[PDB]
Structure formats: structure tokens, C-alpha cells
Amino acid sequence: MKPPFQEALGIIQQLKQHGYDAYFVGGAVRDLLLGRPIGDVDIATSALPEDVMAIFPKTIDVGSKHGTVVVVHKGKAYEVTTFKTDGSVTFVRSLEEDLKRRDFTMNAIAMDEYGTIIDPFGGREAIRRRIIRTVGEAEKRFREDALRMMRAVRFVSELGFALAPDTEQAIVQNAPLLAHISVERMTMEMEKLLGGPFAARALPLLAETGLNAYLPGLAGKEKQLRLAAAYRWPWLAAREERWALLCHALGVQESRPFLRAWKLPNKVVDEAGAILTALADIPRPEAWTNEQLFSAGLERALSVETVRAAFTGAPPGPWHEKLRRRFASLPIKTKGELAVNGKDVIEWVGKPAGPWVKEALDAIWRAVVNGEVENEKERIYAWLMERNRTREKNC
Amino acid sequence: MKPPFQEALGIIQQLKQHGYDAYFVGGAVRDLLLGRPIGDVDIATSALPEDVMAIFPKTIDVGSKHGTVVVVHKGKAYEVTTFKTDGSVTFVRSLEEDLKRRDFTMNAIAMDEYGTIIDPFGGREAIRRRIIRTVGEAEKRFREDALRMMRAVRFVSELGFALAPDTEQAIVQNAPLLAHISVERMTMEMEKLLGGPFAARALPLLAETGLNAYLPGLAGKEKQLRLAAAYRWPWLAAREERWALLCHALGVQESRPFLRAWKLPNKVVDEAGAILTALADIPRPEAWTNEQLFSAGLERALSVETVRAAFTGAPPGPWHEKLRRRFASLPIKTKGELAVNGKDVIEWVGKPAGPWVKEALDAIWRAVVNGEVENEKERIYAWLMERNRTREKNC
Ligand SMILES: [Mg+2]
Ligand SMILES: [Mg+2]
């Protein structure tokens, strides 16, 4: 009885005492059998959502409409679910009828309070063999929910399982059905597929199956995806960096339109381009300039080099260290630190408040950062003065 | 800085460090200022749902669509909410614009990381004066959501605040608007209103305001409600017992149709009847009979006597003690304990399996429970035998 379940045992135990019968189902089970670290433990029971909210003090209705209720037990969230058969939804009392609705064998295992594995569908073999197989007719399933084909590729990314001959086949055959699923639900899948320690072979597959050309911006990029294999995906730390590379490997032009089609939140789509851009502008890690670095701000700067590593093959280490070094040598790290404010430049150059002011400060920092003049009021003054009569000798 | 908030401080603290600005808003605040034990601490912020799910490890999307996200911090659930103006919903950055959307003054208070109360709407005075006042035009508010009038009466139940002259007035005027709100949402409100330490005066009000005659089964019972005042509501322990009494005080006939209209879950509407029934059947606490008790099974039995107390004025104490005493003297406490099963009566009276069997066993327990015959196989046998030739001397 590994600690993940140990704690959550209570929930089962309690639901059983009130005469209900419940099981650990789900990834948690697979993850145990497979020997991955165990993430969320999930419980399913014959107890109806209400009965669940009656027995446990802290409850959190998430969707009692489809039989799910989150139960805060001993300071951890647990997803409790009333057995169901995907039609509205129908509640039953048969564990077996519930698992039979699950997506792929390796998911439809279950384990009881005593630790006794209940694999009625071969999950257990699927996991030994490291294979993704559909629970029932690979075809029929995909018809009910096309997104199921998405996840299949995803799982390949997160687990390094291989598709099943029949499963894989079916996908290609029913690929089109995808254009019916909301973009949203497509994003999240693609999102996980990209952090896969196997993404390196997930993306290719995405093309070798029909699935390509029904996903936003991935029209006919077949070639590009397969080539993607080489990219060192796994070192991508964060979301932006991920999408960043997704582009650069699809030889994408304008970042903005594309990433937006995937209905990603703005901040991402912006910071995505940010890097992509900075990446195109600086082609070599030696060439980062006090300016560009200052502009891009440490975080991004590093994220660039990493995206870059993800492509070159070169490890960031040395760069990341160097960047972090310089960044603390920049005699200013944000504009707010500038010794000298816009109203200082006005009272100084006897000129009315305008657009010329931007340009001014915009050249005072670029001059502080580049170590031309100190970041002290007095000195920036002379500096600006003696530079303005120079623009009278130049024209 | 009282412990309930002390712990949740972390959340604010972290959201501020990422440049967002958040506050304890809600009942928590009211409860502090009022001096009640503090229930759920609620946080609202300018950080958008996503930013919230980015910063905290364990998140639980409940409804990011309306700006709410549950954040499990240090082993407790906290309802975090992006500031909003009730239109779909519009997110802002002004705390003030958020509180301005809250139902009643006493709710629209807020407190900052340093413990500095922000009452921009008189909540703080409302709490001193112990009054329920609408945030803005009592009329306009009720038009947006009629249920707001419900809560108003509820709060009276939970708090013992009085309605505001203008608030109260408005309710009667816009009473009708209620029939537009889903029954579901009406039940929950009624539910809380019944557990009120001031329910005793909440139900009356419910009638003195239009609000009566738009709520299920509460058509023209005006009289009944006001009289309700006398009932010792507050000793009601559980849900059934509550509804039980709600009936008995409205002089309700058939429990089943009524309670159902309030879309209460079956188990309740059954156990409600259960008591209401056993209550009509046994009019005095001395009269419980081994049979009846055995039938109703300790729990309900007590629940009867309490519901009764809630009405008579007599304290349960002595009865609840006496019931609990007998119930362990009943020589059986369920039918499952019966020494003798139905297949025993068949191989015994050489007759084919039928309906006469029920009637048999159904008189063997009734005879065990009443202490006529032991609950041993042998002895029940003779007893059954020697009683069956008696049904030959009788006709
Ligand atoms: Mg968990
Ligand atoms: Mg809480």
C-alpha cells in the first residue's frame, strides 16, 4: 500500500462503511503498475454525488451533473466519481460498466481497499507490453469522441508507449472527425504532448496519422513535423519556450496569428513571439548586447538560449551562467532605475512636453546601460547637454 | 491577525509578489467584524484565473468562466476570484468595482494583508446596527437577481439582522420575480434559512414580504408561517427533521408531493415522511412500542422525539435517553438478526415458496421483539408449529 493511496484509503473506507463500494481507478493505478511516480489518485464509487457530499465534510461540487465531486480529505483534493455509462449520463452500480467507458486499456484498471488489482480489459498486459490500445472498437470509440485520437498521440509523448496496429490504423481512417472538437480542448492536448519526454516522437506520429491538418496551423506541414524529431524538446522548461520551438520547427513566419488560432492566453502568445523574435535577431549566444539583454530582461534572455539549445544540440549551462553574470553588471536592470525622469529632460532642454521626450530618455538609458555615462543625475545632464550641441555640428 | 486569515495570508502575499494585489473579501470579513466564528475565508484579486493557476501548485478550476478558482494552500480550500462587474462577465483591476457588485453592505467589506478594513459602502455601520441593506438600489438589485430577496430573509435567519425599511419594502414590491429562478437555487436558500438560529422569525418575514406564494407548496399558507414562530426550530439537528417540522407547521397533508416540489434528494423526502408518519402514528412519547421502535430504527426514533420537542416545547433529553435504553433491550435490532430464515419456515410447514412466507416471518420477529418467544431456532419452531394448529381451532 504505497503512501499515495494509503492516505486516500480513508475515502474508500468511509464510503464502504455506509454501504457503497468504491475503488481507486485511473492513471494512479496505471502509474503504479507502470512504476511512474503517482500523481492524482482518483476514486470512483457507486455512491451518488449527493451521498458523497453528505458523508465528507469538505466537498467541492465540480460537476455533479456527470458524477464528479472533488473531496478534500486530510488536506488533499480527490476526484470522486459516481459510476457511469457515457450516453446526459447514466449512473450504475457496476464498477465494470464504468471502466468499460474508459479511453484506453492502460487506463481502465482499478484497485480495491485491500490492494487487489481489477483488470478486466487487459490494461495489465498493455502496460507490460507498453502499448496504447482502445477499450473496445478503436473505430467506434473515436466516433463518440474524436479527441480520443489526440490523447493517444499524447500518451505516446508522456509514456513512450506505442500505438496499437488497429488503434493507429483507425486514427488515420477517422482523422477528419477532429474538426468537430472545440479548439480549447485541442490546445490542452497539444500542450501536454509538448512536455512529453517522448514528444520527440509524438509530433512525427501526429503526421503519420491523419491527425495532422485538422489541428490549427498544422496544415500540410507533414515534412516539418517529422523533422521535428531532432529537437531537444524535453529541455524546454516552460509553455512559451515550448510553443516557441513548435513554430521554429514548423518554419513559421508570423508567430501572432498562428499561436492565437490555438486560443492560447495572450501573455503566452506575446512571450512566445518575444523569444522567437529575439531568437531571429540574435543568431549567436556570444552576441547578446547589454542593450538587447536589458530589453529582453533576464528571464526571457535565458528562455531564448534554451529554445536555442533545444534546436542546436548545445547545452545552455555556460550561456545561462554567462547571461546571469552580465545581467547583474548592467548598471540598470529596468527603466524605473534611471537616475533621471522625463520631467527632468524637459526643464532641462527648455522644450514643451512632447514625443521628442521619449527618444531622449530612450537614448539616455541606452547610454547608461552601455556604460557611456554614469546613472547619476548631474552626469546625465552634462551628457545630454553636450550631446545636443553636437546635433547642431552634425547638420 | 486571527488564525483563519493568518494561514491564508500566504495566498495574498504570493499574488502581491507577482505584482497583482489581492484581498480577503466576503463573509469571513463580516464574520470577523461581527464576531462570529469565521467560516470560509475568501480571496479576491486582480490576477486572472490563469495567473492564479500558474502561481499555486494545486489549483482546482471550478468556474474560471466567471473568475473563480479554488486554490488548495497549506491543506485548505480557498475560493480565489478575479475582480468582476456582473454584466458573460467583465474582469477589472478595481477592488471597488468588485465589492460594488456584492449583494448586501455587510458582505461587501474587504481586508488587506496588513489587516486594514476597506468598507467603502457602510457595511461596517450596517454590522454595528445589525442590518441587512442592499448595495445600491434595493429595487434594481432584486431585478437582476430575484434570489437576492431570498437570501435577505435567510440572513435574518443566520444572523438576526433586521431588514432595512427600503430593502424590506422593495421585496414585497418585486416579490413576483422569484418564479423565474430555478427551484434548485430556491431549495438551498430555504435549507439554510431553516437552520437559522433566528429561523423562528425568518419564516414569518417570508410571509410579511411578498416572498411567500412564489416558493414551492407555500401558496397562501400565510397564517401557518407566522404561527410557525413558536416552534423550537434550533433544536432540529438534521435536514430531514427540519423539513419534517416545516410540514407539520404548515399543516401539510401528503409529505411526498410537497417536499418533492422542492427537488430535495429522495432519501430525504422519504426519511422526512418517515418521521412525519411515525409522529402522527405515535402521539405520545410513552407509547413507543418495541414493534414501532424496531420498525423505525433508533436514529429515526430519536429524530421523531426531537421534531416533537421542536413543537411541544418539551426537551427530548429524557426520551432520547429512554429510547436509546430500550433499543439495546430489543432482543433483535434488525431483521437480519432473526435466528430463522424464510427457507426455514418452508421446510417446516411443508408448503411451496410463496407470499404466505412473508406473513410468517413478519410475525416471527414481531414475536421475538415483543419477547413472546426466544430468538433461537428450536424455540421459534415449536412456536410456529403450535400457533398453526391454533389457526385451525379459530376457524
Ligand atoms: Mg491529488
Ligand atoms: Mg476554507
Task: Give all strands of the β-sheet with A117-118 in edge-to-edge order.
Answer: A59-63, A68-73, A76-82, A42-45, A22-25, A110-111, A117-118
Three-state DSSP at B263 gives: coil
All residues of chain B having their beta carbon less than 8 Å from the beta carbon of residue A51 are: 267
Q: Within 10 Å of residue B222's Cβ, how many Cβ atoms?
A: 15
Q: Identify which of A240, A244, A374, A239 has the alpha carbon closest to the alpha carbon of residue A308.
A: A244
DSSP symbol at B390: H
A23 and A127 fall within a common domain: yes
Set of cell numbers at residue B249: 407547521
Q: Identify which of A125, A143, A109 has the alpha carbon closest to the alpha carbon of residue A26.
A: A109
Set of cell numbers at residue A190: 497539444
Where do the DSSP E strands lie in chain B?
22-25, 42-45, 59-63, 68-73, 76-82, 84-86, 89-91, 110-111, 131-132, 162-163
DSSP symbol at A208: H
Residues B277, A114: Cα–Cα separation, whole Å: 42
AA letter at B93: R
Question: How far away, in angstroms, is B4 Cα from ligand 2 center?
Answer: 8
B149 and B249 fall within a common domain: no
Q: Closest chain B residue to A79 measured between Cα atoms?
A: B60
Q: Which of A50, A60, A74 lies at the smallest CB-CB distance from B60? A: A60
Q: Which of A62, A75, A76 lies at the smallest CB-CB distance from B62? A: A62
CATH number at residue B194: 1.10.110.30
Residues with Cβ within 8 Å of residue A226, at least 6 apart in sequence: A203, A204, A207, A208
> Nearest ligand, CA of residue A76?
1
All residues of chain A having their beta carbon less than 8 Å from the beta carbon of residue B50 are: 265, 267
Contact between chains at B75 and A70 (C-beta distance less than 8 A): no
Residues B40, B43: Cα–Cα separation, whole Å: 10
CA distances from A58 to A52, A63, A73, A115, B12 (A): 10, 15, 7, 26, 22
B381 and B395 fall within a common domain: yes
DSSP symbol at A104: B
User: What range defines the domain where residue B355 resides?
Assistant: 332-395
Domain endpoint, select from A113, A135, A157: A135
B10 and B127 fall within a common domain: yes
R_g of chain A, CA atoms, integer Å: 28
Å from A221 to nearest chain B CA?
30
Please count the residue pairs, one from chain A and one from chain B, whose beta carbons lie less than 8 angstroms apart: 26
A256 and A320 fall within a common domain: yes
Contact between chains at A75 and B70 (C-beta distance less than 8 A): no
B242 and B223 fall within a common domain: no
Domain endpoint, select from B195, B215, B231: B231
All residues of chain A having their beta carbon less than 8 Å from the beta carbon of residue B265 are: 50
AA letter at B32: L
A16 and A121 fall within a common domain: yes
Å from B170 to nearest chain A CA?
33
Contact between chains at A58 and B70 (C-beta distance less than 8 A): no
Pairing of β B42-45 and β B76-82: parallel
CATH number at residue A95: 3.30.460.10
A45 and A130 fall within a common domain: yes
CATH number at residue A313: 1.20.58.560
Question: How far away, in angstroms, is A151 Cα from ligand 1 center?
Answer: 21
Resolution of the structure in the document, Å: 3.5
Contact between chains at B60 and A70 (C-beta distance less than 8 A): yes
Experimental determination approach used: X-ray
Sign of CA dihedral A138, A143, A145, A151: positive
Residues with Cβ within 8 Å of residue B206, at least 6 apart in sequence: B153, B193, B212, B215, B218, B225
Domain endpoint, select from A331, A358, A375: A331
Q: Helix crossing, B266-281 with B239-248: angle to 10°?
A: 50
Overall number of domains in chain B: 4
Q: Which of A51, A58, A74 lies at the smallest CB-CB distance from B77? A: A58
Q: Which of A50, A51, A72 lies at the smallest CB-CB distance from B77? A: A72
B84 and B166 fall within a common domain: no
A226 and A207 fall within a common domain: yes
DSSP symbol at A283: -
Q: Closest chain B residue to A53 measured between Cα atoms?
A: B265
Residues B118, B169: Cα–Cα separation, whole Å: 29
A82 and A204 fall within a common domain: no
A193 and A281 fall within a common domain: no
Torsion of CA A155, A157, A163, A168, to 10 degrees: 100
